[PDB]
């Protein structure tokens, strides 16, 4: 289930490892546009929070979910900031959301008193009076019900098919970052002069099995002059001695 564009669903993604190269590499995304970020910059940069926003919208309205753009959806259903950092990902759902006779379950707003603020959501059902005369209940004299349904037919034009859109908004706060991309590891090499990086500890040396034991929380050790002498491999909980290269 995806939410209607008016009442879109916002999932707050925090305190996790965010694999983004799979989303870019994955097939069948009709559009994948990044504003201020790049597929070659993601999966590495750490962020405090990521907000996923999911909406079902007609193909012709996909262009409206972008910074600097205008239109009925951008103004009354989902306004995106012009100073936006993140990616807009969308794909065709014609084989999921369309139903015989037309799928009218998805709603959108056409009549709104003012433009929607960036990332502001509205669940109001109040009748739009269009600035003419008192409504006192919706009636056909410049007074309208704000929400209308889409007609998603199994066979329709491509621009009239339903599309599922997910917008990934990246937020940086003063709090320590909690969402980072995956880290890559290499095979462990012993008894050779090798440049190594264990977590954030770097150096060059010869790795050998150690006879020293470290407390469960200790990751590396030092000698009498505070020179790194051994490390505990992040994946194999064994102690490795570091011998300088001759």
């Amino acid at each position: 289930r995806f939410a209607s564009v008016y009442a879109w669903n916002r999932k707050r993604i925090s305190n996790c490892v965010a694999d983004y190269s799979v989303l870019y590499n994955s097939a069948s995304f009709s559009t994948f546009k990044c504003y201020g970020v790049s597929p070659t910059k993601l999966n590495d940069l750490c962020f405090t929070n990521v907000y996923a926003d999911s909406f079902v919208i007609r193909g012709d309205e996909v262009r409206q979910i972008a910074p600097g753009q205008t239109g009925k959806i951008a103004d009354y259903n989902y306004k995106l900031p012009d100073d936006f950092t993140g990616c807009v990902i969308a794909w065709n759902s014609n084989n999921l959301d369309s139903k015989v006779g037309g799928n009218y379950n998805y709603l959108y707003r056409l009549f709104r008193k003012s433009n929607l603020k960036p990332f502001e959501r509205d669940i109001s059902t109040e009748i739009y009076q269009a600035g003419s005369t008192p409504c006192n209940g919706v009636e056909g004299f410049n007074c309208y019900f704000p929400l209308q349904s889409y007609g998603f037919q199994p066979t329709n034009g491509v621009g009239y098919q339903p599309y599922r859109v997910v917008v990934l908004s990246f937020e940086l706060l003063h709090a320590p970052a909690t969402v980072c991309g995956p880290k890559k590891s290499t095979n462990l090499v012993k008894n050779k002069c090798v440049n190594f990086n264990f977590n954030g500890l770097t150096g060059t040396g010869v790795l050998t099995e150690s006879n020293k034991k470290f407390l469960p929380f200790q990751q590396f050790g030092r000698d009498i002059a505070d020179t790194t002498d051994a490390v505990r491999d992040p994946q194999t909980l064994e102690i490795l001695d570091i011998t300088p290269c001759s």
Partner: nanobody
Amino acid sequence: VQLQESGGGLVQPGGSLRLSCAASGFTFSSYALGWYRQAPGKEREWVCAISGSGGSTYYADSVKGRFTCSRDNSKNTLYLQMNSLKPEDTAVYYCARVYQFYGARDYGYPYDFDYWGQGTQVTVSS
């Protein structure tokens, strides 16, 4: 970047005409271009779109076969041949530049565009 207008005309039903719109502006460099169809009583209709860097081309169901959509990247000209024009196909035909149109299979229809065709009246006389 700038648009252009070339072609149009009145034909007998069953006849054919040539359309096109040269690429203008010093900033144009093999950007996807396509053809827009508009009429006072019709919804906005996309005729075709061509990807300058690959040649992949989107066609509408009413366009496939009947009309030929092509682009010459050496002359930077966008050309479409309106073969076998029907009375039902009369409309104003515009030349727009496609920002994006094909990130997935079962697609090709243009999503975003910027500058719309000035004016090319294509009609028939029975």
